[PDB]
Design an enzyme around this catalytic site. Structure first.
Site, PDB file in Angstrom:
ATOM      1  CD  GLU A  76      -8.941  -3.170   4.183  1.00 29.54           C
ATOM      2  OE1 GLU A  76      -8.026  -2.959   3.353  1.00 29.54           O
ATOM      3  OE2 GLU A  76      -8.810  -2.986   5.410  1.00 29.54           O
ATOM      4  CG  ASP A 130      -4.241   3.343  -2.150  1.00 27.59           C
ATOM      5  OD1 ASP A 130      -5.203   3.536  -2.930  1.00 27.59           O
ATOM      6  OD2 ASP A 130      -4.195   3.819  -0.997  1.00 27.59           O
ATOM      7  CG  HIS A 135      -4.758  -0.313   0.434  1.00 25.20           C
ATOM      8  ND1 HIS A 135      -4.771   1.036   0.712  1.00 25.20           N
ATOM      9  CD2 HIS A 135      -4.859  -0.941   1.633  1.00 25.20           C
ATOM     10  CE1 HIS A 135      -4.878   1.223   2.018  1.00 25.20           C
ATOM     11  NE2 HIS A 135      -4.930   0.037   2.598  1.00 25.20           N
ATOM     12  CD  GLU A 160      -0.923  -1.648   3.027  1.00 25.13           C
ATOM     13  OE1 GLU A 160      -0.376  -2.680   2.545  1.00 25.13           O
ATOM     14  OE2 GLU A 160      -1.841  -1.683   3.890  1.00 25.13           O
TER      15      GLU A 160
HETATM   16 CA   LIG Z   1      -3.397  -2.561   5.593  1.00 26.09          CA
HETATM   17 CL   LIG Z   2     -15.051   0.808   2.434  1.00 25.60          CL
END
Ligand SMILES: [Ca+2]
Ligand SMILES: [Cl-]
Ligand SMILES: [Ca+2]
Ligand SMILES: [Ca+2]
Ligand SMILES: [Ca+2]
Ligand SMILES: [Ca+2]
Ligand SMILES: [Ca+2]
Ligand SMILES: [Ca+2]
Ligand SMILES: [Ca+2]
Ligand SMILES: [Ca+2]
Ligand SMILES: [Ca+2]
Ligand SMILES: [Ca+2]
Ligand SMILES: [Ca+2]
Ligand SMILES: [Ca+2]
Ligand SMILES: [Ca+2]
Ligand SMILES: [Ca+2]
Ligand SMILES: [Cl-]
Ligand SMILES: [Cl-]
Ligand SMILES: [Cl-]
Ligand SMILES: [Cl-]
Ligand SMILES: [Cl-]
Ligand SMILES: [Cl-]
Ligand SMILES: [Cl-]
Ligand SMILES: [Cl-]
Ligand SMILES: [Cl-]
Ligand SMILES: [Cl-]
Ligand SMILES: [Cl-]
Ligand SMILES: [Cl-]
Ligand SMILES: [Cl-]
Ligand SMILES: [Cl-]
Ligand SMILES: [Cl-]
Ligand SMILES: [Cl-]
Ligand SMILES: [Cl-]
Ligand SMILES: [Cl-]
Ligand SMILES: [Cl-]
Ligand SMILES: [Cl-]
Ligand SMILES: [Cl-]
Ligand SMILES: [Cl-]
Lengths: 348, 348, 348, 348, 348
Positions: C303, C243, C270, C220
């Site tokens: 996530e 990311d 990410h 990330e």
């Molecule tokens: Ca993390």
């Molecule tokens: Cl979220």
């Protein structure tokens, strides 16, 4: 200011450096007293009249002076004593603890670990250390795999399941012995495996690290930045243990700590010698930067040897003592200690 | 003591840190003013009330705080400004030049080198620099091999056979261009070849080092200890050029210098920015340990840019000036300088 | 067409780019709002009048512009916001979802995983996530081996034997802690071990991968193609986590995905930030090519953080929501979303 | 939209893909016509009904389909034809030049280089090419060191000191021949040394690169991303020469270009085949990102073969021609060309 | 003698080569029939009039002819068919079994292994194979770790504790899936793990070998000596599986076997195709030199697929059949077989 005198004392050699304004600094050298004293005496020919505040310049000039004499390790142990005394003088001149000069106090104390019919004796002794409050102990092995395992097993039983346990073979093993020991002892809960093999064979260290699961520690005799870097490059250790009075003093151990961070290798300073060496080690421990920084990080712990401890601490007016397993770090100027001169006897 | 305030100023961002006892320290950050100021402002939330003497602890706490924001370089440039100001404060508190705190003054001055129809203009300008007393100059290339060679040839002719000559491509070349340039320019007598290729391609640097004979230099944008160590490990450079205001300040450049000694790689600090950055660089240069120590060793030299020099030095009461090619290093407390606040304008 | 304006908004910085024909694109930058906004403002000096369809040329020109400022990471996070907005504009201009422009939609949705007295709280919370339909969850560790293990054990008990479990130390551990944790937690059934150690020590990551059996994930904060390639070359990770709003936007994450395929390293993007970052991540996830292609391949998972989720999604008119653990990927032009401007406040 | 038909034509195999809305795209495959056509016919069983806009998904599905047939290279040459046609269709559907879809036009044209009693014939021919305006030429060697040197010497004499000269051995040499040739020819001013040894021996390429100073080029037969990455990892080349119609089309050459940037290796696309291959190569060349970006960067140049050029360009309504050594890059939708169907003859 | 004709047949392409004295040889090519036939037809332009006894010269001339067409794998599969037919002709001309020409018969037979609601079906089928006398079986996985494990577990139960078991994922897994599968399946007693990951990622193979304990096998699509050597150098496999009809025929597989001995890597020939391919494989197996030579050495075993076996063997007058798990190796001239021409249909 200027250095006016450099003196060597016994009771382990101690280095005393006096300045024109009266400031006195104290240091200590690893190893045989006489060789160290002779070299310090040699170094003093140049030191007299020099500015004690210029520790890096002094270090490098003196280190360079002894290069072709072949005795790199001796240069470093001798220089260490001088270097520690000089930082003591800087701290006194500047009105600052060495730990502050090194960059600040992360901690005001450290946890100590205790170091020790060999089976029952270790078991009894280590059981008492736990009662005294030590969070951890280190037992000496390297004599023979089967006997060493009996010792380790009896010590774990005696100290209960929580107290941490480290083992130190003092280069007693072949690679095969060390791997076999580590494999069979790992089940007892061992935080590190100190100096499994001879210190010249860095690849053997790496072999031990790859062949068994206990973390390997070493470094008390790997000289300064170059010796440390060779071990780090070989993948010799999980834990590096530089000796302040052996590796080149505060100036050089700072550089060693830097190298260790590149490799994510933990530093745990070797502590052994008189109260002076202990005091120096504690100043460094106060200032050691966690790797990584986090709440409740992994912190240095201090080897504590009740053997000749009263004797080794006799050089101090106020002994650095473990109280329920914890040692408080002095915060006065320099090493933050006062020397008991009566306990010493001047050499040469 | 305690930090009571942290302020940011422009005219290049300058960092001012004031303490409860009235002590004020000054620092500077590499790069775009606004991003640096915002981060310094962010850092200040924590800095207020902290003990400015604890520079290593402050460094590591602040560096760790900005890890998952992705902007490692920005953390370091911002931290650099704070770190320089803190050392300035330490020097003032302790009554010592930063160069003394860093371990002593090897030198009271450094030789400067001068940095600069592109062919005739370089030739004329560099000819004047020689008359002004500079022992060396650095010319900017990286536009095109044939044109760059014409420039190099004309500059060597104009400056005579003795003056040293360096070249800087500012990552303008492909590997092939750089190797070809280096091969063909080597005959002109070139002491180093700065940033031949893009700074992310460390293996390309190594390629340039192996393919042509001029020593390769780089490092002004390789962050702190980890970025420097990656370049050293890749064999990217013969000369490392850390920027004090970019790599993490005095705390971090000391660690970088250590790493360079393992590799026998020369350090020549990047000098560029306001009088504050220059003052900081000079303190470091005074304290730099020769590698190796010998009589008349190889010493740092200081980049001197007559472009906007009056402007960049306007922040100082007394300008750091080259006199017949030589710049004297201040020896007063901290950076040994006084800030001309009128020249500044406060930001936020 | 031409860019007529670039604006920065807060509420996390958002980038708005308007074109002469009225087309508006939106993007987001990782990290501190103010530094990102300043750089975007700087970039905009050049962007105005440029053709927004030329995303690679724009990327490379802007990236190259900020090279000697030292702040590579900041260049990438700032560029990311611009780059995402530009792809949004391309999608709107061309009448295509970004996922189609990236090369096609492999999937119309992704499975989400849920991210979270620390022992009971994790156990309760994760037990609720399972009831909500999440196939997996990730728990935060890196505080201390013994306590972290208690947490892991309680979470596995609470979620039953089927739900997948990941752990994230956020660089909280030393290598030794991480190896010890991984060895002892592996028995609980852990799909990956995120950021065990500090992100600068790639060899430490590799050490953790070789010393314990849980797959290691990271990325990330490893910048763009060069940072990612360094980690891949060091053998740092089993799973790479770029990311989008940090690594250089769609233009750069495509290149990162390519690199990962050479190494057979899985990409799991990410996901963290406002609804804009989430929308961008989902477009990339729709288009991600399986490695390998097979029936029912291994697919990206997303996530999902219920913390400030309502807040972070307030920037969208229609929130991207998990329904029984599954998130549907928009298929309209560009990011396929509509901005709620009222939720924003313009900066500068 | 949907693919309704896939057809193969001769006059070198050409791929025609027609869509439901009437859009037609054209591509070309490297190598023997019949094997390529059979595989395209095989691929078409699945392609019919698919969405031509999803080029990455189509690429990966088709590439994966032919894995265990052993013929990786054939998969890639066949896929290349399809992939080029699909991008042509995307460009037409979206109203954009492929160069714009690839990320923007860095350049509207490229400089061409001309490719060619063997001594006098080369000398004469190359002398005419210079008069025609070509900035550079490439001569074919690999027959015998002494004879090849005579040719190189006569060509340099004939073309004057300014025109650039490249040599191509088409894997004709042993390592020793190639090193000896390169050492002795280097004095003539040679920009690159193409395919000195057999293409399977990547370490031999590296040997040639290290043993003589002319930059080594190769890649026209090193398959796709994996083959290219093997050569890059072995240090085989200074210049990579992917063939669009051989390496996997636009989808795969983009990935190859990415890999080359990690290594700082220059891309110069192989140009050879009908007007379709040439048109595709030029779209890629327009979009190629300089490495590094600078004013007047190093730019792709285009191989131009007057041999069968009228024939190979007969497939186009408007020939892509060199005017005083410069070739203009089409900017219309897709490949920006129109097919002369009459020149073709359908196969199967 | 001289080749007078080369013909291609279907029913999988078969190669028939006729000589002036009437001798006819037969071979087979891996992969798609039409591409192979076209290349064989192309090769035949030169083959006619050549001496079929000169197999190495023919191999190298033909292999070199197709180098710049990009299709190395296709060259090898096409050449394989020719090469096998040529050895068949040599054997007939010389009055010798190919196994004798290859250097002698170590064995007159080989043990076969059998290859195969997916759980119950595999279990039933494999249980029948054991009853039929096969010492071993290989089951197909690579669909999903949990389901694949269920299959493996049920097959081990069904076949009892003695029968050997191999698994083949046909590149179905990511590295992580493969390592996890191997770790969890190892307890079932698995002799090898075939093609766990995509065949282009040799380092991924090595990753699978180092991460789990089942021996890894691969090679059916790694071309000839160079492709095999790359895999051996990467440490990709414990077992190499060259395909005679794919890797370059008898001439090239002999060279591959040599390479494998340097690495102490076992050869187990891929067996799949018509009776001709099977016959060729068996001749090679008869002649394979044990590594090491000892009493009862490790010997090649032959994959036996009851799927389309009657069909694939229809090309032979006398089928090569497994009798209680054992296949006898023909010892007549050449491949020792007779072709059933009626079963074929000529192509082109
Ligand atoms: Ca993390
Ligand atoms: Cl979220
Ligand atoms: Ca006691
Ligand atoms: Ca010890
Ligand atoms: Ca072991
Ligand atoms: Ca002047
Ligand atoms: Ca520079
Ligand atoms: Ca050279
Ligand atoms: Ca809930
Ligand atoms: Ca372990
Ligand atoms: Ca002409
Ligand atoms: Ca060529
Ligand atoms: Ca040579
Ligand atoms: Ca049966
Ligand atoms: Ca198989
Ligand atoms: Ca394992
Ligand atoms: Cl005293
Ligand atoms: Cl010594
Ligand atoms: Cl203090
Ligand atoms: Cl040393
Ligand atoms: Cl003690
Ligand atoms: Cl002030
Ligand atoms: Cl001072
Ligand atoms: Cl760093
Ligand atoms: Cl200056
Ligand atoms: Cl909008
Ligand atoms: Cl940054
Ligand atoms: Cl769409
Ligand atoms: Cl990067
Ligand atoms: Cl058309
Ligand atoms: Cl366009
Ligand atoms: Cl490939
Ligand atoms: Cl052409
Ligand atoms: Cl026959
Ligand atoms: Cl092929
Ligand atoms: Cl025989
Ligand atoms: Cl090969
Ligand atoms: Cl069979």
């Amino acid at each position: 200011m200027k250095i006016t005198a450099v003196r060597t004392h016994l009771l382990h050699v101690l280095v005393e450096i006096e300045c024109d304004d009266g400031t006195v600094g104290w240091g200590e050298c690893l190893g045989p007293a006489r060789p160290n004293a002779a070299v310090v005496q040699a170094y003093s020919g140049w030191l007299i009249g020099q500015d004690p505040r210029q520790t890096e310049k002094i270090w490098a000039v003196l280190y360079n002076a002894l290069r072709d004499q072949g005795q790199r390790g001796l240069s470093l142990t001798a220089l260490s004593g001088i270097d520690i005394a000089l930082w003591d003088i800087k701290g006194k001149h500047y009105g600052a603890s060495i730990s502050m000069l090194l960059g600040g106090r992360w901690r005001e104390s450290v946890r100590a670990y205790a170091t020790g019919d060999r089976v029952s004796d270790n078991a009894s002794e280590m059981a008492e250390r736990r009662a005294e409050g030590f969070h951890a102990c280190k037992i000496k092995i390297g004599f023979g795999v089967e006997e060493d395992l009996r010792v380790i097993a009896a010590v774990r039983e005696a100290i209960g399941p929580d107290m941490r346990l480290m083992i130190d073979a003092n280069h007693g093993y072949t690679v095969t012995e060390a791997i076999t020991l580590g494999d069979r002892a790992a089940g007892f809960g061992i935080d590190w495996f100190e100096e499994p093999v001879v210190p010249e064979q860095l690849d053997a260290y790496a072999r031990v690290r790859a062949g068994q699961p206990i973390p390997v520690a070493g470094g008390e005799t790997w000289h300064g930045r170059y010796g440390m870097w060779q071990a780090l490059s070989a993948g010799a250790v999980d834990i590096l243990q530089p000796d302040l009075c052996g590796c080149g003093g505060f100036s050089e151990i700072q550089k060693i700590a830097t190298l260790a961070t590149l490799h994510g290798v933990r530093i745990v300073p070797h502590v052994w010698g008189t109260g002076v060496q202990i005091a120096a080690a504690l100043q460094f421990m106060a200032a050691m930067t966690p790797d990584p920084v986090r709440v409740n990080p992994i912190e240095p712990i201090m080897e504590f040897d009740r053997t000749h401890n009263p004797f080794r601490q006799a050089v101090l007016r106020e002994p650095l003592e473990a109280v329920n397993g914890v040692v408080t770090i002095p915060d006065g100027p320099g090493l933050g200690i006062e020397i008991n001169r009566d306990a010493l006897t001047e050499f040469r």
